Design a protein around this ligand. Sequence first.
Ligand code: HEM
Length: 377
Amino acid sequence: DPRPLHIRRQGLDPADELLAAGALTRVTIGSGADAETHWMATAHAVVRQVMGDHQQFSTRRELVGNLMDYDPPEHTRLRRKLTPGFTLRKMQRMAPYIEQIVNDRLDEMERAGSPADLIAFVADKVPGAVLCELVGVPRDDRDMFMKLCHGHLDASLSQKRRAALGDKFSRYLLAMIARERKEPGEGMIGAVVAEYGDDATDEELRGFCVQVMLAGDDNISGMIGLGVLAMLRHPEQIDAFRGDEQSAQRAVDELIRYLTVPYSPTPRIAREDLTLAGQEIKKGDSVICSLPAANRDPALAPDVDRLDVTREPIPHVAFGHGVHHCLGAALARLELRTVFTELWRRFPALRLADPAQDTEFRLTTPAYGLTELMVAW
Ligand code: HEM
């Protein structure tokens, strides 16, 4: 394997080499004139210390509205400004909408008949539709909006195409923001402007939309796909999605902890010299935290390496830690819970279409996941 240790998985787990590295050690990513050195933190307490001490570890190093690029006090102000579109009450209001979105996708899969690819019908479609509903993109515009969203970032396209889709995407978003300023709706944009008005600038809001579209897509499709695969491999646990809501929420939390789809959060930069876990960190050093390794730290529980949806909950760092803790965490838990509950309500006998087949993992994104999952029912 020529890939960095923090990118390695073995099935649903961290790779053994990644798990056996030190709590904090040096690594070099890349070669020749590209090669760089970083510290990699794999221990739960070290990742919490690094991520939680923003006075000591900065996330900077332009993109307006990208919260991850700022440090307090600038971060604090921007995050406060976007928070109205993510309150727990706004999430409760979204639930009916997310249930309809999931059922519409399940309907298409049902119509296609067994066996069918759960990744193409559900995992890769729900995330985007849910974000469109959150942002406030009108139904009939979603398909078009999503091609612009993905398109303006497709490295495979020429400068001329990417640029054209990008100019089209900004124009769509800016037009949406101006519409919302006039008559604020319940979407994210409308919630922010209703509270801040002109203080939330056009560029801030446009940038917020781009970043949210990015932050809540890959992590969720990876969790939908790896989550169904994990449950089908532990069938006695599926009942956690066939009971009350508490039961399902606890199963979703355990799956997020067990699978930790993001390999690492934004790299942290030491803003000064310090000693951490016995190592001497110097002003300017870069630190990469392995969230998957941290959520498999042995001190967390004697059976931390197993999936147990009924265990005593283990606080995890899959949504990060500190001021940058996932702003979309509540929506993510709700979305995943809705997907898994409606899935097993509709397909009680869901199973792998071919139990012998090798698993097709998605190894090219910032989040682990599946590229295809054939299921039958
Ligand atoms: C299973 C799903 C998800 C996982 C595991 C997850 C994970 C993360 C992590 C680890 C961070 C912290 C990054 C850092 O400290 O550098 C974070 C940040 C963030 N996430 Fe999520 N996320 C998920 C879903 C979502 C969704 C559904 C939304 C969008 C509606 C969202 C929006 C964001 C935003 C805006 C930030 C930046 C917060 C800030 O910098 O203050 N995430 N997420």
